[PDB]
Design a protein around this nucleic acid. Sequence first.
RNA 1: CCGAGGGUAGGGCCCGUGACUGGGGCGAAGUCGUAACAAGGUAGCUGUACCGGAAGGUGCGGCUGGA
RNA 2: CCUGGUCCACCCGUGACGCUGAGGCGCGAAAGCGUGGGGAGCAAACCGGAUUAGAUACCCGGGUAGUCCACGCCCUAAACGAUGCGCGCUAGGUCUCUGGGUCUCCUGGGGGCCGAAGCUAACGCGUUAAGCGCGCCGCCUGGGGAGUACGGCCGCAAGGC
RNA 3: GGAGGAAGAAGCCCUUCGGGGUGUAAACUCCUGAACCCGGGACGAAACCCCCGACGAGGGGACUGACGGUACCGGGGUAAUAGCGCCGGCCAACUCCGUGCCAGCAGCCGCGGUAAUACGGAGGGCGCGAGCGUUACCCGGAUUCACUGGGCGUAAAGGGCGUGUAGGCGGCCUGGGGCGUCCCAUGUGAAAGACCACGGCUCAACCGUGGGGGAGCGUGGGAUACGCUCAGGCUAGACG
RNA 4: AGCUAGUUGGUGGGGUAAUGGCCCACCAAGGCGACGACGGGUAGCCGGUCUGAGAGGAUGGCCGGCCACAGGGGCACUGA
Lengths: 138, 150, 99, 124, 208
Amino acid sequence: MLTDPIADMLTRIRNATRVYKESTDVPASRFKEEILRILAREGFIKGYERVDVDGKPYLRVYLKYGPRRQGPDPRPEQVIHHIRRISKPGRRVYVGVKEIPRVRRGLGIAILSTSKGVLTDREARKLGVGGELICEVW
Amino acid sequence: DFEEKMILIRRTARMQAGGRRFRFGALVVVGDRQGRVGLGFGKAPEVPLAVQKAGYYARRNMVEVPLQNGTIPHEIEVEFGASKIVLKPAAPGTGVIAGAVPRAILELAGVTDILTKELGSRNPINIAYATMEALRQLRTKADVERLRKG
Amino acid sequence: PKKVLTGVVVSDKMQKTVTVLVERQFPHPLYGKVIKRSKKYLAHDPEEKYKLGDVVEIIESRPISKRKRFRVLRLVESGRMDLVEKYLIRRQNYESLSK
Amino acid sequence: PTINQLVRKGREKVRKKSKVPALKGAPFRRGVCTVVRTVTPKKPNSALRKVAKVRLTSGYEVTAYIPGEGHNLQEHSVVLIRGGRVKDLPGVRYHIVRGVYDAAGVKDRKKSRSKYGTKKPKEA
Amino acid sequence: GRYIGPVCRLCRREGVKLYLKGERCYSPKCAMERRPYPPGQHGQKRARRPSDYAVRLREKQKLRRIYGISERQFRNLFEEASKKKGVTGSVFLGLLESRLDNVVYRLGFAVSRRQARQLVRHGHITVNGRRVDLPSYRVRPGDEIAVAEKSRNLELIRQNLEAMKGRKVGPWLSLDVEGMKGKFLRLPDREDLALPVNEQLVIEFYSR
RNA sequence: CCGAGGGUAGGGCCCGUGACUGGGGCGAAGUCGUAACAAGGUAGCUGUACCGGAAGGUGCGGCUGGA
RNA sequence: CCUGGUCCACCCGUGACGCUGAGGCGCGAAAGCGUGGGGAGCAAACCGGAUUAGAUACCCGGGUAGUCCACGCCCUAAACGAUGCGCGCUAGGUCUCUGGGUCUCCUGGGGGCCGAAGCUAACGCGUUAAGCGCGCCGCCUGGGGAGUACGGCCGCAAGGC
RNA sequence: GGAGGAAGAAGCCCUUCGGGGUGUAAACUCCUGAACCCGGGACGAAACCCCCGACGAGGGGACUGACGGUACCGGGGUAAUAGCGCCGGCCAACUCCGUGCCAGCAGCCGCGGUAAUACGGAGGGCGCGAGCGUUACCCGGAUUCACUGGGCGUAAAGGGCGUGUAGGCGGCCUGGGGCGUCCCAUGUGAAAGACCACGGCUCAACCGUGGGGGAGCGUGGGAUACGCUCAGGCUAGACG
RNA sequence: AGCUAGUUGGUGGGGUAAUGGCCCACCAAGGCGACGACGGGUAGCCGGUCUGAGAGGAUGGCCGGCCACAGGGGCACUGA
Ligand SMILES: [Mg+2]
Ligand SMILES: [Mg+2]
Ligand SMILES: [Mg+2]
Ligand SMILES: [Mg+2]
Ligand SMILES: [Mg+2]
Ligand SMILES: [Mg+2]
Ligand SMILES: [Mg+2]
Ligand SMILES: [Mg+2]
Ligand SMILES: [Mg+2]
Ligand SMILES: [Mg+2]
Ligand SMILES: [Mg+2]
Ligand SMILES: [Mg+2]
Ligand SMILES: [Mg+2]
Ligand SMILES: [Mg+2]
Ligand SMILES: [Mg+2]
Ligand SMILES: [Mg+2]
Ligand SMILES: [Mg+2]
Ligand SMILES: [Mg+2]
Ligand SMILES: [Mg+2]
Ligand SMILES: [Mg+2]
Ligand SMILES: [Mg+2]
Ligand SMILES: [Mg+2]
Ligand SMILES: [Mg+2]
Ligand SMILES: [Mg+2]
Ligand SMILES: [Mg+2]
Ligand SMILES: [Mg+2]
Ligand SMILES: [Mg+2]
Ligand SMILES: [Mg+2]
Ligand SMILES: [Mg+2]
Ligand SMILES: [Mg+2]
Ligand SMILES: [Mg+2]
Ligand SMILES: [Mg+2]
Ligand SMILES: [Mg+2]
Ligand SMILES: [Mg+2]
Ligand SMILES: [Mg+2]
Ligand SMILES: [Mg+2]
Ligand SMILES: [Mg+2]
Ligand SMILES: [Mg+2]
Ligand SMILES: [Mg+2]
Ligand SMILES: [Mg+2]
Ligand SMILES: [Mg+2]
Ligand SMILES: [Zn+2]
């Protein structure tokens, strides 16, 4: 019955990439989209589009991996190395603007809901706000 | 030719009717000090020989440590089986704080300012192995957004 | 500011007085997660106007009797016995905790 | 344990046992010798260790170790007690401080003497 | 404090040489020039490869032993820097150098450091007017470290001020050799200092 | 009137101690057997029951961590 | 005869009515206990016969509770997958049980074996996860002392928690 | 105490009887003068009080020091206390002799049974210094109570199995509230300590001045993504 | 692991600088507890202090703020 759909989505992705799949349809949702948007607007994906599997609306989300490789295990590197939910359904995590994390020393991002749209670390810190830390991606 | 410092050497042994035969082990690091290092493990019927083989594989397998100010790009954690290692970058003028294993490996790799913590299994061997894969997985703002092209 | 609180009347069996059950929330000092916790306040009701099951606002009033330092401010919503049912059950479950 | 579980049960603080009830969190304790005997080592050792049961001030009583070589401790000798065990004589868990009360220092000893309470001798 | 006893003996041990002596350590007889081996019955023996500790220690020890300072103060000083902002490497020395008994060595006024001290101590030295006898006294930027009027007339301040005439001196100092009185221009920069010691290692020995 | 406490009486908890008694821990090289580890020389372990100087045995069902 | 769960098909009805679950309650192998039946075979105990240094055993001939039924207790276990339950996601190969279809094929539930990726200290796991995640419950914190002691609750007891 | 001082005294310790070591250390030589001797000697003390003005605003005058003849300044001036810990490994420092599971060491692993760097003395060495060691206790290392930051197939660890009470957790969209949550302003958060700068005592310790911060909590305003709550709709969970 | 008789509330009084079951009469039968009541153990509390990368853990001596006490215990008097 999916306790937390978001943490699901993230995992849907996390599992996809692990074997380098084209796209993956996580059931649709305005908030998921909002999140997804920032994966594309920030470039962890080609992007996403609305779809349907019998009146039932998922989201086609096209991954994005690195260049093939020399040596053994020629499998490419990944754009999304590590994605994991922060605030959880059983331990909501909130932060003032000063507390906001600095993911992977500037190299990564920390998506996070707020009273004025789903920002990110830089995005909120600059916008001058805080809110529910949603997850960390890099 | 690079630096080549010797981490640890041990005498192991096996059994056989009459007594116990032997063997020695050599875990060795290597690095000019420009961002290049290689770990190599060498087993052989004698101390010196083993230490030799050390450097040989050492040079064989080496890695591009993307320095910066003499420290490191980002903070990372890696588990190698039961042994886990934390590498966190420090400001110029701090020191290379670590155990003999991770420090040795870290010196010849260049670094001068790095914070390190040795969690999990502290098996010398395995810590080494761990330290490498850490570096191996180091990124710079460059090769970062180099993957977020499109 | 004379503190105020909002809670249900969970007992109306006193002369001119009601037990108002009152809930509050907060983040846990080390394990984060918001946690629920409540108290009970004994509330002056000089017109016995307030009946059982009513959600109400209370206010930090002058000491009326021992154990009794709050007056019933004003009604918030009549008919809410569903919350009362939660109280009374929690209480009834106690019988099954002794020897 | 789920977060919730910690909000309920919560983690339990360790707390350790005082390896030495020398009493009121005391540096040392004074006492008198009830017995002065000579016990024998454990697992793979062998010898005759000089030990004394002491009647402490705290109505107590414990077997204590006598450091060094030779001594002067009899059935009524006073003494001060230090407290470290002896991985060898099950029983003894305190040491006698040499050079206080009826406890002579170590005779003719010249090396480390803080331990063993011998005065610094003149060279002449 | 300040050790006191056999010195061309750590001049030994440390390997690297030092001039806790001044003149004679220039002789072809520093005992160092003669016995390039550390003291004691052994010295001349197949020396075992030091432990990573052994190194870090020896280094710091070496350095410490140079300014002939107490492990306490050396430590207090180390921390003094550690606390202060910036690269502790340099700063530990910046203050190591501000010591009046060191400034009155480097500013030539004396031959050995262990003589400079005794000088400052006996008050023979001075500062911006008022005399001083505080070896530890940390010299800041812009300070007149003269000699004492009573002390200009000393054979030894003389023979020390002797060869000093014209002899070039630190790029963070100055020496009006005529009027026997130098100034402290600034806080050194790593390079300005030349000493046989990897500052890092010390930093590391106090992170043990 | 209440009231420090004192007295009488009966309960509750905790500490110390007690002929004697139960097992338990440790102790370089004691007496008795051989139970287990190799098919351990009757596969082992197991809950329960009964029995025996002791390990243990046997019954009943069970597990393979046995064949 | 009475009755539980469960799978499939049709997309019909309700409209989130869900997941979990401290305590509570119910069930819970064998042995064991109570009252009353029953009793062929088997068989703790027990008796012999052998073996043996001895043989309170193994093997042999006997043999009583018990093993069976009714009602009531007892509540343990290598109560084992030594793997809590629910949901989503992450290659397939093979044979097997049982449903449904314009049935050399396809799909749904279930029981197995080899195995991607991944996990793993290793052995091994692997869409029946020990992978990747979320929820909620239970549990561990060096060995022996000891599942002992005390207290408590339960039980006829044995004993259990 | 500082500078010089042997291819390097004697004594003592090793020794492959050539030698090696303490060691520039000592002696010795000059210069410096802790101490002590003589002199001079405070800040801390300007008010209360008096005169004029008005007993006021303002002006002037005078008394008072426990420490104390102490600090501090000047002159003379003697080479003038060193001790403790360790040197098997962690962990730095090694050789002789004595000893012989004895005497003893001991935080752990362990050492001692006739050639002991592990006991005991010695020589030497490492370490610190008016201290060095020891015992006791607190935190650390211990990521070994694990929020940060751990685990349960066999290492300790899944409840013998269900049912379900409280509780924890909650699918898709729309709207209202704005409780959590987020931002701004304001009050508060004493001083001392702490941290950053600057000066006072010859430095420092101490000590003065200034600045900058502090979660929390009260108050006023604002935001509405996620959580909550009320209201409306849906069918992918669940039920029939 | 259950607690409670001034116990919870009420009316009227007494009392105080003033609220109040603080106290006294009469009335009703309530009040509290697994969010841990009651009971036992231990402890003065804080600004701070020690330690720690930090989150924490330990701690409350000197100094400052508050409380408590003055051989053990009770009492009231004078009085802002
Ligand atoms: Mg692991
Ligand atoms: Mg022995
Ligand atoms: Mg009485
Ligand atoms: Mg057997
Ligand atoms: Mg056997
Ligand atoms: Mg057998
Ligand atoms: Mg049996
Ligand atoms: Mg039998
Ligand atoms: Mg409908
Ligand atoms: Mg259930
Ligand atoms: Mg049963
Ligand atoms: Mg049965
Ligand atoms: Mg029966
Ligand atoms: Mg038979
Ligand atoms: Mg028969
Ligand atoms: Mg089974
Ligand atoms: Mg369960
Ligand atoms: Mg199947
Ligand atoms: Mg398989
Ligand atoms: Mg499959
Ligand atoms: Mg124990
Ligand atoms: Mg047990
Ligand atoms: Mg039992
Ligand atoms: Mg009992
Ligand atoms: Mg060593
Ligand atoms: Mg000793
Ligand atoms: Mg010795
Ligand atoms: Mg450490
Ligand atoms: Mg901790
Ligand atoms: Mg955790
Ligand atoms: Mg663990
Ligand atoms: Mg186990
Ligand atoms: Mg199970
Ligand atoms: Mg179990
Ligand atoms: Mg529920
Ligand atoms: Mg709000
Ligand atoms: Mg303050
Ligand atoms: Mg009362
Ligand atoms: Mg007390
Ligand atoms: Mg820590
Ligand atoms: Mg009194
Ligand atoms: Zn020299």
